[PDB]
Assembly symmetry: C3
Homo-oligomer: 192 residues x 3
């Protein structure tokens, strides 16, 4: 772990991050995964709540070449671990074992379209549920109950930074998933 | 107002920016709203025309953590990150309960999938018209006639920076709307 | 006439100049690799030796992104303007649309196809001979390359994202029979919508 401007970044490779995520699936508790970049670290400077959340996440992966370039001053970061690429690699691995995934986030139809694209890419992928990221506080509890009841183990949150990390942290004791990871615009790129 | 590398940035919070926009609706003249970030501020360095436009806009909101981090050097730094996408949604949220909105910009059907989405999110929202942002100089005057005749008060321009600010500025005396704001890729994220 | 911005060579060209360069590339019977470096790309090249080697071997590196253009202000001869990759791609197509077989490779399912339908409506006369998504397998790779070659494509726009797009073009540089091969990032997604 190297603390880049208050935000702790885990000194892991793409392979190492993927292995950490699989190991997290063996523990029956929620693990918060975040992919900090230059924008995220800058957001943490002004936002004390956001920085507190980052300092409490299970894995902070070095998304973005900015952080990796800055780390060259320090034992620097081994490689750029992209959040989109990590999500796809982690999903690729876990489709063969049938781990229940839930997609929460983005505009209407984006999550169902990404689910369709991921099924075509990774045959045997178990995406147990989807919901858009434009829900209200009243709708929030019904989405949480849906995830919990559907038996979801991996939850990908595409609400954008800091919204995704803040949502996961606020509901950390309400969610019964093994991994909860902020993915941002990831659902938009795969759905098109 | 902070002078970040020649570009004036308004020292406002999310709430303050929304209230400013609501008050702009009470003045019978066009108000140009821009959401500068590090990419925009850097564009202004080499583009004198663009920097002149940004020094002539009614409200420059600090979108992007870069500007907000840079402001930490000043005696009076910026209070928070006021994201352009988040501002556009919060403003629409308030005025939905019947201010006439027009969506101009993005590829074919994006502005229309955006409109349909905003109508589902904010019931009662009056989006009086939409047009794609890939129009010709001939088509330009028919769009401007459409906005003016349809009685639009708020105009969201999704042409990208600096294209959106330059389009608004060039047509500042041809448009009969109270607010004209550059929203870049806000239309694609809400449409999905 | 080239600026070494942190190991990555950037061509000191304007929007017009870049377009003319591309039009002249069409007169040479060999593949030309076009890349649009920005601060993210430039930074990716620092840790990725393979990627920096590719960027030092491309035919045209256009100044996409204000960061590079701002950094260049330090040099005796700075960069004249930003040459945005999306804007370059559209201006180039605009021209060649009246005359040139284009192939769109990249992005999610139906994105390249919707980008083709939109470019056909924007630039009437545009000859887009084929499209394919960018989530293909190594087995599917050769059928796409055969499709591009057999359909007689001259211009190939690769929307795979940096560094994936430049690495794909470079790895297949001697397998592709096109005159121009350019990394266009998320350009297909903005035009398709
Ligand atoms: O209340 C919101 C606001 C946005 N979004 C989604 O969040 C993503 C924002 O992507 P962005 O690139 O801005 O985030 P980043 O990669 O910086 O974290 C998009 O898919 C939006 O549709 C959402 O689901 N809920
Ligand atoms: O001639 C143009 C060029 C662009 N756009 C739209 O403007 C946005 C381009 O912005 P981008 O995603 O590149 O990011 P930004 O520069 O705003 O940060 C997209 O909605 C495009 O479809 C448009 O309507 N007309
Ligand atoms: O293996 C992959 C991964 C991504 N993409 C596409 O590559 C683009 C990535 O866009 P991005 O904005 O991340 O790239 P940049 O502008 O930084 O080069 C999107 O259209 C994705 O759908 C693809 O075709 N193949």
């Amino acid at each position: 772990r190297l603390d880049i401007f208050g935000v702790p970044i885990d000194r892991v490779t793409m392979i190492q991050a993927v292995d950490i995520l699989n190991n997290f699936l063996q523990e029956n508790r929620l693990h918060i995964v975040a992919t900090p970049n230059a924008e995220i670290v800058m957001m943490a400077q002004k936002d004390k709540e956001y920085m507190e959340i980052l300092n409490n996440t299970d894995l902070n992966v070095p998304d973005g070449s900015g952080i990796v370039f800055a780390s060259k001053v320090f034992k620097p970061l081994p490689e750029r671990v992209a959040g989109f690429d990590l999500m796809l690699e982690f999903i690729k691995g876990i489709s063969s074992k049938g781990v229940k995934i839930y997609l929460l986030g983005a505009a209407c139809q984006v999550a169902e379209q990404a689910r369709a694209n991921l099924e075509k890419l990774y045959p045997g992928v178990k995406i147990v549920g989807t919901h858009h990221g434009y829900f209200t506080e009243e709708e929030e509890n019904k989405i949480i109950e849906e995830i919990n009841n559907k038996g979801a183990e991996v939850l990908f949150v595409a609400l954008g930074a800091p919204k995704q990390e803040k949502w996961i942290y606020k509901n950390k004791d309400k969610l019964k998933v093994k991994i909860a990871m902020g993915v941002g615009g990831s659902f938009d790129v795969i759905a098109g």
